[PDB]
Amino acid sequence: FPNITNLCPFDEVFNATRFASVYAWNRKRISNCVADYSVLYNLAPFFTFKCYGVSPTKLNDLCFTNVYADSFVIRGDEVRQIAPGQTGNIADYNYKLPDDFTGCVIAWNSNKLDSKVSGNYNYLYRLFRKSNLKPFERDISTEIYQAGNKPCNGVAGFNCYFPLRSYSFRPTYGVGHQPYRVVVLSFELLHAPATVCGPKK
């Protein structure tokens, strides 16, 4: 095992002031770590914990390469679409996982941070797009959607709509419409020299 000893951030990802909106999600690279996954085992009553290819009880017993953790926020009972191999409104235009995955899908139902009580218009998501996305692709352009054969000069009119739309989270809608901070974490097994390893002598 390598002789590195410094801890690396699993506290600047799960404990963050503001997650990125789903249409433009934020990706972080984790490397050169003595990585222990026991810190996130409790972390409030997880609404979802599925790792798709490795038992979560044995994660600090393996050495990975180029771990990538990326996070965003979801409307509510919609994190069902983050599983691989299924389609939907948000798995087609916002974020799509491949058919083969090797990562966990932690999500933990924050409502005391992402719900103002007033008007919350800083969490957007794409609604209109010509074609479906591609696995692990980010679309960031804000251009006027054109659902027709007539060119658009840059203003909203007939079949000349706008793609982005706000969520407007409220502390009243219950559980179906209630913000969900989501973090997915993909890692590739040993093919190259290892950089991230668990704690072992």
Partner: antibody
Framework: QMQLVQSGPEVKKPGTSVKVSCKAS????????VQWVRQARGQRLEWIGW????????NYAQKFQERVTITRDMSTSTAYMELSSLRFEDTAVYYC???????????????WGQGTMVTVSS | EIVLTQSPGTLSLSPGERATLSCRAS???????LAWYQQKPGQAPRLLIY???SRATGIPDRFSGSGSGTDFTLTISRLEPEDFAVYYC?????????FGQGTKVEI
């Protein structure tokens, strides 16, 4: 594409409110936009307002600004228009129009409903 | 508000002749947003020409349509005995979207 199915005739009294439903089937309703039109007996057509199905944004005329409300239901695939504070001049036939929009919209309202008659009597 | 004046008020052509209609506009409107509808007595209107130049699907080549800017015209080559209805013109470029007066074609 099939002409949008519209509700049946209504007879109301002045003061109350009425609701008209427009059900769409046979084409991709998730991109199209629905406009509402009123016509009296043997008179010119009048414009009420239009709504985007996906976004839900509405637009009305300066006369119907504070009397009509247009909403839609995606799961049922319907468009509803509620008109309140009926008067003697509100008795007419209402039409529902949308473009036949599959993979690409038709650039014109070529699908029209059969029309619903509302009579404000006493 | 955009105001559309449709002329002439009434047409009295025998069948088999040439028919012309005009939909003059108060202000300039994009040629990409203008439609001509036909209205039979006691029936819903139907779309004939959209975009001021392109016919709708399943429409005979008799109806042509032309014009741009502030002058739009509709032309019918031969009057079938079923082409006697009320013709409206509607612009949907900028809100509000306003119809026309209507032109009646008789025998």
């Amino acid at each position: 594409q099939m002409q949008l199915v519209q509700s049946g005739p209504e007879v109301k009294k002045p003061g109350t409110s009425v609701k008209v439903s427009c059900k769409a089937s046979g084409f991709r309703f998730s991109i199209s936009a629905v406009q509402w039109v009123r016509q009296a007996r043997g008179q010119r057509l009048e414009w009420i307002g239009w709504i985007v199905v996906g976004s839900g944004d509405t637009n009305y005329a300066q006369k119907f600004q504070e009397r009509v409300t247009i909403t839609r239901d995606m799961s049922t695939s319907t468009a509803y228009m509620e008109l309140s504070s009926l008067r003697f001049e509100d008795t007419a036939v209402y039409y529902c129009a949308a473009p036949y929009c599959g993979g690409d919209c038709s650039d014109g309202f070529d699908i029209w409903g059969q029309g619903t008659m509302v009579t404000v009597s006493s | 508000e955009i105001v559309l004046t449709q002329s002439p008020g009434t047409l009295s052509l025998s069948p088999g002749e040439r028919a012309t209609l005009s939909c003059r506009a108060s202000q300039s409107v994009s040629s990409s947003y203008l439609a001509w509808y036909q209205q039979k007595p006691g029936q819903a209107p139907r779309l004939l020409i959209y975009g001021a130049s392109s016919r709708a699907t399943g429409i005979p080549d008799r109806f042509s349509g032309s014009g741009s800017g502030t002058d739009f015209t509709l032309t019918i080559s031969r009057l079938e005995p079923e082409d006697f209805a009320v013709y409206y013109c509607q612009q949907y470029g900028n809100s509000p979207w306003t119809f026309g007066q209507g032109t009646k074609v008789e025998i």
